RNA sequence: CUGCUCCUAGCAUGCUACUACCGCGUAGCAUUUCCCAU
RNA sequence: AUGGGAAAUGCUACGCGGUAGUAGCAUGCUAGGAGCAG
Ligand SMILES: Nc1ncnc2c1ncn2[C@@H]1O[C@H](COP(=O)(O)OP(=O)(O)O)[C@@H](O)[C@H]1O
Ligand SMILES: [Zn+2]
């Protein structure tokens with residue numbers, strides 16, 4: 001399931017999540033990362 | 046349709062897609078912009094798309110000439126060439142593309158969100174044409190934002206003048222005032238026609254709203270009121286005209302032995318004459334609009350037109366001119382809407398007059414000999430070049446004060462803006478100094494000038510009148526809503542109502558409330574001469590009532606309060622909620 | 636050739652329990668912002 | 674001298690449902706190997 005739109009969107013979501021976790025700016029930003037992760041998992045499912 | 050570029054101003058005819066205003070770009074400039082930014086759409090004599098219907102690629106990064114049109118790689122004909130040039134973009138004129146590199150600022154202009162003060166300050170630092178384009182795109186951004194405002198899914202209507210308002214969920218339900226423009230749309234499965242130019246302000250008490258439209262039915266349930274946006278027109282004239290020094294007078298007709306207060310300012314008037322223009326930088330209250338009518342008295346012969354930012358200032362100017370200058374040579378141009386009242390004694394929009402007045406947004410496109418503009422702080426750099434384009438005279442006068450509050454600029458929700466960077470003129474005023482300055486607040490007596498010069502201003506200000514002994518204060522807090530519903534301090538209104546009788550000449554004291562809800566409810570309760578600061582800008586009153594509701598970045602603004610107090614003449618009474626702010630001034634407490 | 640049984644493997648289904656996340660729904664608690672001209 | 678106060682960002686608790694992963698139960702079938710009886 002590598003060459004799939006869900007896979008690519010999840011990869012971008014993970015990239016943004018790790019980037020913003022390294023930034024460590026806001027708790028709401030981290031919640032946004034978690035929500036993006038969760039919809040990425042949802043579609044990847 | 047061909048024009049010059051912007052960064053390099055070479056003759057070209059390319060435009061960008063993602064850039065909202067779609068400006069003319071040369072080849073190299075456009076290539077740089079599309080390489081840097083994410084703009085992947087270029088406009089020319091035709092749009093740029095993969096001509097093959099089985100493709101929908103609009104990216105300029107790859108596009109292949111399919112004989113006469115553009116193609117993708119999967120549809121590229123064999124004998125065909127990609128149209129991304131050797132570090133440029135292929136098209137109209139390439140042999141006369143002069144080079145210029147200042148694209149990074151231009152990229153940032155088409156990048157930033159105008160929520161950070163860095164955007165606005167950087168905007169007022171670039172090339173003139175870049176400044177005009179930035180102002181234009183900012184105005185367009187504001188129009189787009191206000192377009193996406195509340196869609197009032199109302200349910201009830203009270204009377205022919207009064208109605209009940211309810212809104213949808215998700216979009217910003219805008220405030221209600223005569224300034225805004227709304228219109229309902231009959232959703233009857235069809236005939237979604239405009240019901241008329243509908244203005245709206247909140248009702249007197251409770252869940253009540255007063256409605257007034259160009260037509261006025263008895264509104265139904267299923268309608269909604271959506272805020273539409275007006276278009277923005279491009280401009281060409283410079284914001285600021287160049288300066289030229291002279292030797293003798295520039296052809297103006299004097300009036301010997303007319304007055305006395307302005308014979309001392311005759312030197313200043315001649316200083317204006319010896320140059321193309323001049324400006325005025327001084328504190329409020331001290332010969333600002335008054336240095337104007339006497340200057341007109343110096344040369345009251347040419348056929349002239351003036352204007353002002355807001356309506357109160359121009360109406361006060363009309364009254365002052367009637368007081369000094371003959372009436373039947375001056376006029377005031379009114380707009381078509383005219384929902385906000387004006388000088389309802391003078392000529393009704395008589396453009397054919399010798400000394401004409403008007404508002405900023407309703408100016409004609411005629412010319413004059415001299416001109417003066419009001420409150421550069423309240424204005425942007427866009428309207429400056431707008432009036433430069435529509436109006437072209439031989440002498441220009443500008444007035445303003447950096448301590449005043451600037452234009453709203455609501456999109457800037459972060460940080461404060463330095464007074465010089467309010468517009469180009471304010472930066473020039475703070476960098477090169479004034480052209481002529483007057484510093485002796487004449488309407489307020491010495492106690493007010495002492496308080497303002499000691500606390501916020503520099504200790505340089507002075508007055509001409511001694512203390513009027515009408516200084517009083519109040520500090521107790523009161524309660525507000527605390528959950529949206531901009532603060533309303535009702536206990537203070539009740540205490541004012543109970544007290545006022547003891548104060549004999551304060552029955553007509555000008556009530557002040559910047560907040561619209563408090564502004565309405567105060568007149569609803571008693572009917573004091575209600576007023577807001579914004580609309581007190583450039584006004585003046587014998588008896589004033591100021592009311593602070595609560596503490597907030599708005600109500601704690603130093604400039605707001607100091608511009609509020611510069612309007613005291615003989616008497617005033619005002620209240621706070623803040624301790625150190627209550628202690629800051631040097632008046633009697635009570 | 637019929638009937639009975641054992642064992643193994645796989646599949647598939649049903650049901651049960653556990654774990655995670657999600658959003659919803661409800662309840663409680665608590666805060667953060669606070670608005671203006673045409 | 675009056676029984677007319679929200680937008681909701683944040684915390685906690687409960688439930689639902691979905692999704693995924695884990696363990697368990699029952700079954701339904703298939704296939705294979707083997708043994709007994711007539
Ligand atoms: N030289 C002066 N002599 C008397 N009154 C003056 C003088 N200069 C200004 N004023 C008073 O100031 C009022 C107008 O305010 P102004 O000083 O023009 O500044 P602004 O209008 O921006 O506050 C006028 O009513 C006028 O009476
Ligand atoms: Zn662009």
Ligand SMILES: [Zn+2]
Pocket residue numbers: 050051052053054055070071072073074075143
């Ligand atoms: Zn160029």
Ligand SMILES: [Zn+2]
Pocket residue numbers: 095097099100101102116117118119120
């Ligand atoms: Zn294609």
